[PDB]
């Protein structure tokens, strides 16, 4: 397990240590080989059932349901329905934070099973029921095999010295395959540096790195000497020659050589097997992430300085952890994907160490507040970590963590480095003076993360969790004509979405007014793209009769259309990524129906009506040019200008639309986390929540600063946060912190 | 080898002197070689500058000795902002340095060549004075400002004088240095506890001396001390707000971080003999202001987000690291870069790197950069393909790591030697990261640079310091209601390929405003008075950007942002009528309608007038609109009309990029010599840099006709921005003279990454600019010149009969719109249907020509001319508005036409007017007179020349005959095997003066395919006043029949090599060699095409402007009855041989027909890619049933359907 782990992905080691503790399990002495049930772990999903789904005493969602029907079949669980009925503790189970850790005993047994049987019976129960815990079951599972700390040295930091010197023949290179923004080239520099060792390091590419290369390694096999090729995967022809001519060297011992690259799949598969594959990766967990970073920095680096150096480092490690940690969150947490890498931690340990030799110059026992927190503040907001950072959200994010870390009142013993870490636990400051102390209490960190941790809600990983269980089950499972079909689709989306909407008729006073502006507009590109879906579907369905012919226009879309891509023709309007047909044209038909409400409105009435429809931002084209269109409205109605103007936001929930004469509804937005009672926000554990009827107003700007207890929330399109389209000013209820509020991801989405 | 030695030694004079002893040991190869290598390595190493010269210029410099006046070429890229150098009279004596722009710095101790008459010595004694020249004036500005600045109420004389004593970039260091210690002393001052704030005196003082500087600006000034109050208004506004921030921040200590944090300036005049006086230190770095003289540079509004580029490139500069900003395009990346670079007083060298970067370049070009010192600032490094991104990631890594020893002489490892590492020298890169045409870094290079994020400059603080400087007084207002504006027209107007409104353009409004204040002013002043509308201005300059390329529906948008935003504002165009009659005289002189407001040809006149104005502000131009909407003759107009307007003789090269390989366009430098030649842009560039010809003295305009994507036109990245110069990976840099324009006529910027776009002026012509009459005037205006005299008196009175139908709701147009309603095989556009009716209409009078040849007495009178022209030209309108639609279509077409017109027509009541010629007496004919019941010979059936005539032959090939009579390019489109090269072929036998050479297109074809043709046929290559490419063949017009000329691949960006270079040498008339890159043009070339529909696999839809130049002709598979009859003659002519089979002959060829009518129905291509069946298989049946029955004698019917 170590060494085929040592060269995987994390998410992969789960899927192999089942395998390995199955291959344990059938070995053993006496106990059952367990086949009927893992038949079902593995492939129960695909059993077909038309309609015996039925939650009992509403107590399950209907997958939930359907999961337990499945599960029925079973001979140990044919009284799972009747037994979750009488119990009135599996709903509390159910709603448990950690329910793989006390699993209620519900599967009927003529005797009694092995503690192996018990875990695989637990392991198919928690599939059933809570698939977010799958894998967190999955890994007790492997305890009760395998043993408890099976999977552990991969928790530990990466030993290269030792690997280097043992268990590496000479003529074996070493592969170090970096995922996308990682590189281990700095690793064997400081091995290399350490043992003393020299190293030759060449980059790959422009045909002078090949001479260069091949005489390295012909100089350095007949001596003894490490060689380092950078990068070498953009020259896989030549890594082929490479891979021929390792195998007949025979080199001097001590000899290495080590092959930087990308994971990407054009490497030689021969190189793979003839190599060591070292696959290096974001740490999992902030305990991880800790401990190769204490690991990194050399002990006499740290505590050179007064005492408080060896704090400042550990707040800086932490803080980094938890930086690195909340990308896994992408769209809760940092909304892009930046590369916070190692060398941002090296140039702030950098800057700490310059700037504290700076403000104490030798002298001991600097005082808490007397360190230049002011200058790390803000080259680790502006400089550092803020410099990959784009817009101002995830700036007043990284602003928001650093001013509540790196603050004097630090040094203090209740400091509280994360809270409600349990949902009432709070992870206390270290009261350690010197490294030791600190690595101590790293490594005493429980192993119960959350997401709570980093400041995010604790939902924030329900979905990922269970598409990694889904993964780690399809890995085991894997490893253990189309124009009927295209004529019935398209007939079928054809019949869904509604007919040519009618357009606007251009009177001499509608001209002049920007809402029927926008409107006409609006309405003229929505009659474009369903004459033009419509009239494709129809061409569709009669390629798929046989009476029209195959056009290279028809060859592409049919090709794409069958496969589920959205055709690049119909993405006019911005989409999520990765978006279906289906979804897509779910989503047209609803554009399209609140343009022809439009279409009827304006008919009926040009400029009363116009402006007394509730207009759903998330299905408009384009979103801006209705918030300026308003904006100029209201500009025009009165004598102000457009620049003299700002956003006041309302939620009615009542829906009693008393619009006034400045105020314009828009229906189909939703909060990220929090309620609202009344126009004051709340933090909520709920996903999203649906906002009815936010009215918007627009008044003459004062130029005054707004409240505490006023936060700017961002609206995206989509769940994608990946375009602005304005922003708005709640105030939050009493007892709120708007720091919470910025960390746990609140936004508002159109879509 | 020998011959670069011999081209070498006679550069100059006194270097055969040099070295005699080797002149007959030459005249050993590689000892000689190195010897000079080695040389001219030492030479460079003498002068580190010399580095960047390369040996071709060395050596000239070196050689040149004598004459100094040569020199003063090379200084331009030996320095920053050094142009030429003051001499004594006898030229024996340097006494100064003299920028471009006009402003001497006078040596104080000049340098006497007489006694060091070594060029490396005095260029190195010329360096250090102008070092210690610029040190010492900065020292004695530095007490001058000292003497007025701890002071209040400074009159403006003594202010003035002292800034028109001192330098630009002297005075801004003054200033700041003593900002700096006038802060300093404050902070100290109250750092003895809190207490009283002399704080408050330093920004009083700063207030009041932008006080004297804005009232300073509001009067004329001469153009230097205006951009020396420039500068230090933009400096001391800077100033001001920092203090501002101090003093409500309420900053105690001079250590407090928000005083470090700021970049402070510490001049200590006592230092004992150095250049490092002056000391410039931000947070904790410090940076010895190096003394290169820049000349006048355009200094930036120092926005808070160019505060925090400051602050991480100075912490990335620091620790050896190099700056690598980033973001979306036009947010003053490379300017913040130069901003800091000229700051510190670096020379900075700006380089526009392409995939044409490799290792030994970028080595090379290290080399240099470390050798002297001088920053660099690599724009685009991602445009790097990624194997030379990972490979010079070792040379950056190589220099950061020997560049360290210094915060420990110091050499590093560069291209296999030894060179020496300079801690002034830094290494910055600026990036688009996810724009089309890049590449993405190795982690192995993010780790040797800091990046930083640009991506939302503060421009609302740009447009009120800019303002705010121009004299505007009410700037804070301006900028308050222009950058709303600006936002919210990137939101109402709708998004468009050619759309900016991003910072650039916000900066070209704004200079722009300047521009128009200025020349409103003059022109009162003409006729204090600072009561001018600034508002008004503004939306003049607006007008003048923002409008040419605003789409129809976005132009009513645009102007009710410009009603809202200024309310009661007035715009008023200016009437520009002496450039109004110039067009108007020139529109007469080559048959172009000219037109005013409303007036037919308004819209065009207008799209011509803002032409003007952009050419006015931009050097980069975008002529953007849908083929056949006047672009390229609104600029031919406009070049002829400024030069009888200005008397500047106007010189128009027009290059088609796309045409040509990019290493065709730019130039290469071969790996082994690495000797650098030339492609065709850098050629013209440098020519006009070396104006040879007076070149300097005229209207150069180097104009794109092809297509944009990021492959070529980002190497001009750096033309189009304020660089406004071109870099090569020779390192050689031209700089763009004055006198010259860029311009790209495109038809659309689909493919093109925003960083271009945002780089060029945007005019959009509408397809409404050119409407159908202002082509239908035209046509007849030069039908009654341009003799095709008794020709030109028939082209007259025709164009009289044909005047009542080219009218604006005339039958042409009503055809026309209605012929868009029909389905065409390719694409239809309406410059393709009128050339083709222009053509025949041509034909038509040249028929009338011919007859009245014919007729020496009784010529034809006016009515039977006017007959045949008037139904000639329904018959052209058919032609033309259906050739390449089918059958029914043609016919619909026709139904139509007799609906609406009234001209003499058929009376034949169930037949297709396109059965129907028209004859000489002008009367319709049927042409199925034409077609006989041929009797092919009962041998050679089935022959490659044997035709047997059909309706569809003789109608196709009469036209054809039309349209290859005058030369004109066409294309036959239909499905494989129709018949299309048969029909072609029978045409052109017809003529007999035609060769015709044929040509076969596939998916790998390049021009050079063309090229061999030429070069095989077309051996001669005159020069006459110019290079014709003629045909070998006296007398003959050479055809080249290209078969499936669409088969070409598109490449990444929708673009076809070789069309675009058939476009180009068919429209323009020739095209370059890439030899000499001498324009050749074609002397009795011509063109035609035959392709497949465009919907068959491997196909692809010929372009737009390809299409108007050449019509196309839809030849269809021969329907049942015409295969009967067009076989049924073949199987009589053969059933011959053996006269007992005759009664056979009918049936046999039904038979025939009828089991080709069911596999051409059962095994399509949509089953299998061969599946094709043509009349090409019942001409291979026929011939081999011939064959097989030729010897014999006689045979049973039983023998025959064997
Ligand atoms: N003012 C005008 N009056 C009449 N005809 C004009 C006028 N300007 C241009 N034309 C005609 O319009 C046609 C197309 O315009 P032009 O040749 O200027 O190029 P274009 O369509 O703008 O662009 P390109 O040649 O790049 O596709 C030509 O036949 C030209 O003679
Ligand atoms: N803060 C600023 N003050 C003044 N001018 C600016 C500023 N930022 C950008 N500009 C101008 O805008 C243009 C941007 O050019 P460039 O520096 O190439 O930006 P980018 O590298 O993002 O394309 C330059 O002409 C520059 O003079
Ligand atoms: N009316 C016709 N008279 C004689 N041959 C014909 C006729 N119609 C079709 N064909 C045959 O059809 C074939 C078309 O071939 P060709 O024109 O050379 O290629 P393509 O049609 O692809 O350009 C010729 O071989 C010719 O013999
Ligand atoms: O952001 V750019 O320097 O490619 O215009
Ligand atoms: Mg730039």
Same mark, same amino acid.
């Given at each position: 397990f170590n060494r085929v782990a040592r060269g995987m992905l994390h998410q992969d080691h789960i899927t192999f240590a089942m395998l390995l503790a199955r291959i344990k399990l059938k070995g053993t002495v006496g106990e059952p080989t367990y086949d009927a049930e893992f038949q079902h772990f593995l492939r129960g999903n695909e059993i077909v059932l038309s309609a015996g789904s039925t939650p009992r005493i509403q107590g399950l969602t209907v997958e939930q349901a359907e999961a337990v029907v499945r599960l029925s079949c079973l001979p140990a669980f044919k009284d799972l329905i009747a037994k979750v009925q009488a119990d009135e503790q599996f709903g509390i189970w159910l709603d448990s934070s950690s329910p793989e850790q006390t699993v209620p005993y519900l599967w009927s047994e003529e005797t009694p099973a092995t503690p192996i049987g018990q875990a695989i019976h637990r392991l198919l129960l928690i599939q059933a029921f809570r698939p977010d815990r799958l894998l967190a079951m999955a890994h007790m599972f492997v305890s009760t095999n395998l043993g408890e700390s099976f999977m552990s040295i991969m928790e530990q930091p990466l030993d290269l010295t030792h690997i280097v010197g043992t268990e590496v023949k000479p003529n074996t290179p070493v592969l170090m395959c970096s995922v996308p923004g990682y590189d281990a080239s700095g690793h064997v520099e400081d091995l290399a540096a350490e043992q003393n060792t020299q190293i030759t390091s060449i980059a790959i590419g422009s045909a002078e790195g090949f001479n260069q290369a091949d005489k390295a390694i012909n100089t350095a096999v007949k001596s003894g000497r490490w060689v380092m090729l950078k990068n070498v995967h953009l020259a896989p022809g030549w890594l082929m020659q490479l891979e021929k001519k390792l195998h007949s060297l025979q080199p001097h011992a001590c000899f290495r050589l080590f092959l930087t690259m990308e994971?990407?799949?054009?490497?030689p598969v021969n190189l793979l097997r003839a190599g060591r594959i070292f696959v290096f990766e974001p740490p999992p967990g902030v305990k991880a992430n800790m401990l190769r970073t204490f690991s990194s920095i050399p002990v006499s680096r740290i505590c050179k300085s007064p005492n408080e150096r060896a704090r400042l480092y550990f707040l800086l490690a932490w803080f980094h952890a938890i930086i690195q940690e909340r990308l896994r969150y992408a769209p809760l947490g940092w909304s892009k994907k930046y590369e916070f890498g190692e060398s941002d931690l090296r140039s702030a340990c950098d800057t700490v160490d310059t700037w504290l030799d700076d403000t104490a110059? $030798?002298?001991?026992?600097?005082?808490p507040d007397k360190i230049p927190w002011s200058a790390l503040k803000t080259l680790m907001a502006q400089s550092i970590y803020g410099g990959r950072v784009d817009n101002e959200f995830d700036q007043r994010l990284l602003n928001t963590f650093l001013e509540r870390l790196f603050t004097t009142r630090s040094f203090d013993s209740e400091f509280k480095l994360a809270c409600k870490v349990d949902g009432h636990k709070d992870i206390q400051m270290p009261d350690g003076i010197r490294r030791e102390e600190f690595v101590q209490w790293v490594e005493l960190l429980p192993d119960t993360q959350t997401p709570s941790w980093l400041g995010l809600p604790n939902n924030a990983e329900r979905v990922l969790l269970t598409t990694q269980g889904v993964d780690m089950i399809s890995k085991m499972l894997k490893m253990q004509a189309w124009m009927r079909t295209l004529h019935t689709t398209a007939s079928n989306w054809l019949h869904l979405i509604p007919q040519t909407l009618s357009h606007l008729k251009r009177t001499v006073e509608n001209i002049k007014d920007p809402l029927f502006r926008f409107f006409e507009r609006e309405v003229k590109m929505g009659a474009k793209l369903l004459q033009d879906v419509r009239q494709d579907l129809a061409d569709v369905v009669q390629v798929c009769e046989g009476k029209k012919k195959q056009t290279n226009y028809l060859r592409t879309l049919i090709n794409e259309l069958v496969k589920g891509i959205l055709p690049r023709s119909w993405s006019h309007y911005t989409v999520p990524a990765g978006m279906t047909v289906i979804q897509w044209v779910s989503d047209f038909s609803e554009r399209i129906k609140q343009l022809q409400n439009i279409s009827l409105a304006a008919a009926s009435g $040009?400029?009363?009506?116009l402006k007394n429809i509730h207009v759903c931002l998330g299905g408009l084209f384009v979103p801006e040019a209705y918030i300026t269109a308003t904006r100029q409205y209201v500009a025009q109605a009165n004598s102000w200008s457009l620049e003299e103007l700002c956003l006041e936001v309302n939620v009615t929930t009542s829906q009693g639309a008393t619009l006034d004469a400045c105020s314009f509804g828009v229906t189909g937005l939703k909060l990220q986390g929090a309620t609202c009672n009344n126009n004051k926000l709340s933090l909520s554990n709920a996903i999203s929540t649906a906002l009815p009827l936010t009215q918007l107003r627009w008044v003459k700007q004062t130029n005054t600063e707004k409240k505490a207890s006023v936060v700017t929330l961002p609206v995206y399109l989509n769940f994608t946060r990946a375009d602005l389209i304005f922003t708005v000013d709640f105030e939050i209820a009493t007892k709120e912190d708007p720091r919470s509020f910025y960390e746990r991801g609140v936004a508002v989405l159109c879509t | 080898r020998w011959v670069y030695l011999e081209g070498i030694f006679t550069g100059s004079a006194d270097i055969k002197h040099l070295l005699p002893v080797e002149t007959q040991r030459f005249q050993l190869l590689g000892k000689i070689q190195k010897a000079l290598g080695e040389y001219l390595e030492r030479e460079r190493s003498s002068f580190?500058?010399?580095?960047? !010269?390369?040996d071709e210029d060395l050596l000239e410099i070196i050689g040149n000795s004598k004459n100094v006046a040569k020199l003063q070429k090379h200084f331009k890229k030996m320095f920053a902002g050094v142009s030429s150098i003051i001499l004594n009279e006898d030229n024996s004596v340097v006494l100064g340095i003299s920028s471009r722009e006009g402003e001497e710095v006078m040596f104080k101790t000049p340098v006497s060549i007489t006694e060091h008459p070594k060029i490396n010595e005095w260029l190195t004694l010329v360096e250090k004075e102008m070092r210690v020249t610029l040190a010492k004036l900065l020292a004695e500005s530095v007490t001058e400002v000292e003497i007025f600045g701890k002071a209040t109420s400074i009159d403006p004389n003594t202010y003035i004088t002292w800034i028109d004593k001192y330098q630009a970039q002297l005075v801004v260091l003054s200033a700041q240095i003593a900002w700096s210690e006038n802060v300093e002393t404050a902070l100290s001052s109250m750092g003895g506890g809190g207490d009283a704030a002399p704080l408050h005196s330093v920004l009083s003082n700063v207030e009041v001396t932008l006080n004297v500087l804005a009232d300073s600006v509001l009067m004329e000034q001469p153009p230097l001390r205006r951009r020396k109050l420039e500068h230090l208004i933009t400096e001391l506004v800077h100033q001001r707000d920092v203090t501002r921030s101090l003093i409500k921040s309420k900053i105690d200590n001079a250590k407090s971080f928000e005083w470090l944090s700021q970049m402070r300036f510490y001049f200590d005049p006592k230092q004992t003999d150095v250049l490092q006086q002056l000391s410039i230190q931000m947070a904790n770095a410090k940076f010895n202001y190096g003394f290169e003289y820049l000349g006048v540079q355009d200094k930036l509004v120092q926005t808070p987000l160019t505060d925090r580029c400051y602050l991480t490139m100075t912490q990335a500069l620091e620790a050896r690291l190099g700056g690598s900003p980033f973001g979306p395009a036009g947010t003053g990346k490379t300017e913040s870069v130069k901003a800091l670079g000229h700051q510190l007083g670096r020379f900075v060298l700006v380089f526009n790197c392409d995939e044409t970067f490799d290792f030994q370049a970028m080595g090379r070009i290290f080399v240099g950069l470390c050798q002297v010192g001088a920053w660099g600032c690599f724009d685009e490094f991602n445009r790097l393909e990624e194997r030379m991104l990972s490979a010079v990631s070792q040379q950056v890594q190589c220099i950061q790591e020997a560049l360290r020893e210094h915060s420990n002489p110091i050499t590093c490892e560069l291209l296999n030697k030894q060179v020496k590492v300079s801690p002034d020298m830094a290494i910055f890169i600026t990036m688009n990261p996810g724009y089309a045409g890049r590449s993405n870094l190795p982690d192995n290079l993010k780790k040797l640079f800091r990046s930083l994020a640009m991506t939302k400059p503060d421009r609302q603080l740009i447009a009120q310091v800019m303002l705010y400087s121009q004299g505007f007084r009410t700037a804070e207002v301006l900028a308050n209601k222009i950058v709303p504006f600006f936002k919210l027209c990137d939101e109402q107007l709708s998004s468009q390929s050619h759309y900016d409104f991003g910072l650039r353009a916000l900066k070209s409004v704004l200079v722009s405003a300047g521009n128009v204040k200025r020349e409103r002013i003059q022109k009162i002043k003409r006729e204090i008075a600072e009561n001018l509308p600034e508002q008004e201005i503004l939306i003049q300059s607006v007008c003048e950007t923002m409008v040419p390329k605003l789409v129809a529906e976005d132009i009513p948008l645009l102007f009710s942002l410009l009603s809202d935003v200024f309310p009661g504002v007035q715009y008023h165009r200016g009437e520009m009528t002496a450039l109004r009659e110039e067009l108007k005289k020139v529109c007469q002189e080559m048959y172009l309608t000219y037109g005013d407001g409303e007036e037919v040809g308004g819209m065009w006149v207008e799209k011509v007038l803002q032409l003007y104005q952009i050419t006015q502000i931009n050097h980069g131009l975008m002529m953007v609109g849908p083929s056949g909407s006047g672009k390229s003759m609104a600029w031919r107009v406009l070049l002829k009309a400024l030069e009888r307007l200005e008397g500047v003789e106007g010189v128009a090269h027009i290059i088609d990029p796309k045409a040509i390989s990019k290493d065709h366009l730019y130039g290469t430098l071969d790996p082994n010599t690495r000797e650098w030649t030339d492609g065709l842009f850098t050629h013209v560039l440098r020519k006009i840099i070396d104006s040879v010809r007076g070149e300097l003295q005229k209207r150069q305009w180097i104009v794109f006709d092809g297509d944009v994507d990021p492959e070529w036109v980002e190497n001009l990245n750096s033309v189009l921005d304020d660089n406004k110069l071109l870099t090569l990976p020779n390192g050689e840099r031209l700089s763009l003279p004055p006198n010259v324009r860029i311009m790209f006529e495109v038809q659309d910027l689909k493919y093109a990454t925003l960083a271009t776009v945002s780089r060029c002026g945007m005019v959009w012509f509408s397809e409404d600019v050119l409407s159908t009459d202002m082509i239908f005037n035209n046509f007849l205006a030069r039908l009654r010149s341009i003799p095709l005299s008794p020709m030109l008196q028939i082209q007259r009175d025709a164009a009289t009969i044909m005047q009542p139908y080219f009218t604006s709701n005339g039958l042409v147009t009503k055809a026309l719109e209605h012929a868009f309603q029909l389905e065409h095989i390719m694409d239809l556009t309406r410059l393709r249907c009128l050339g083709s009716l222009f053509s025949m209409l041509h034909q038509a009078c040249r028929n009338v020509a011919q007859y009245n040849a014919n007729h020496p007495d009784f010529p034809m009178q006016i009515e039977q001319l006017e007959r045949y022209i008037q139904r000639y030209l329904v018959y052209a309108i058919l032609w033309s508005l259906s050739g390449d639609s089918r059958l029914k279509m043609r016919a619909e077409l026709g139904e139509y036409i007799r609906r609406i017109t009234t001209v003499p027509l058929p009376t034949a009541p169930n037949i297709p007017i396109i059965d129907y010629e028209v004859s000489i007496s002008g009367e319709w004919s049927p042409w199925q007179a034409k077609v006989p019941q041929i009797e092919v010979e009962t041998?050679? !059936? =089935? =022959?490659?020349?044997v035709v047997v005539p059909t309706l569809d032959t003789v109608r196709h090939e009469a036209l054809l005959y039309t349209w290859l009579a005058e030369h004109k390019p066409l294309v036959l489109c239909g499905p494989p095997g129709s018949g299309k090269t048969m029909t072609l072929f029978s045409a052109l036998r017809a003529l007999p003066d035609m060769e015709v050479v044929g040509l076969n297109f596939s998916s790998a074809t390049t021009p050079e395919l063309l090229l061999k043709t030429f070069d095989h046929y077309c051996e001669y290559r005159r020069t006459p006043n110019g290079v014709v490419l003629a045909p070998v063949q006296l007398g003959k017009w050479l055809v080249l029949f290209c078969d499936e000329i669409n088969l070409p691949d598109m490449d990444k960006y929708g673009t076809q090599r070789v069309i675009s270079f058939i476009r180009q040498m068919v429209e323009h008339g020739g095209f370059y060699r890439t030899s000499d890159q001498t324009w050749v043009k074609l002397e009795r070339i011509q063109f035609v095409g035959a392709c497949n529909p465009p919907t068959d696999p491997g196909r692809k839809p010929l372009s737009h402007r390809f299409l108007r130049h050449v019509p196309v002709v839809y030849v269809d598979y021969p329907g049942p009855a015409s295969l009967t009859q067009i076989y049924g003659t073949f199987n009589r002519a053969m059933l011959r041989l053996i006269p007992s089979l005759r009664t056979y002959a009918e049936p046999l060829t039904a038979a025939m027909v009828e089991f080709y009518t069911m596999s051409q129905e059962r095994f399509t291509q949509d089953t299998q890619p061969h599946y094709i069946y043509s009349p090409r298989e019942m001409t291979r049946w026929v011939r081999g049933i011939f064959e097989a029955l030729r010897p014999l004698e006689t045979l049973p019917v039983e023998g025959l359907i064997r």
């Open positions: 994971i990407n799949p054009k490497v110059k $030798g002298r001991q026992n600097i005082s $040009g400029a009363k009506e | 580190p500058r010399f580095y960047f !010269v390369g041998h050679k !059936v =089935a =022959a490659p020349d």
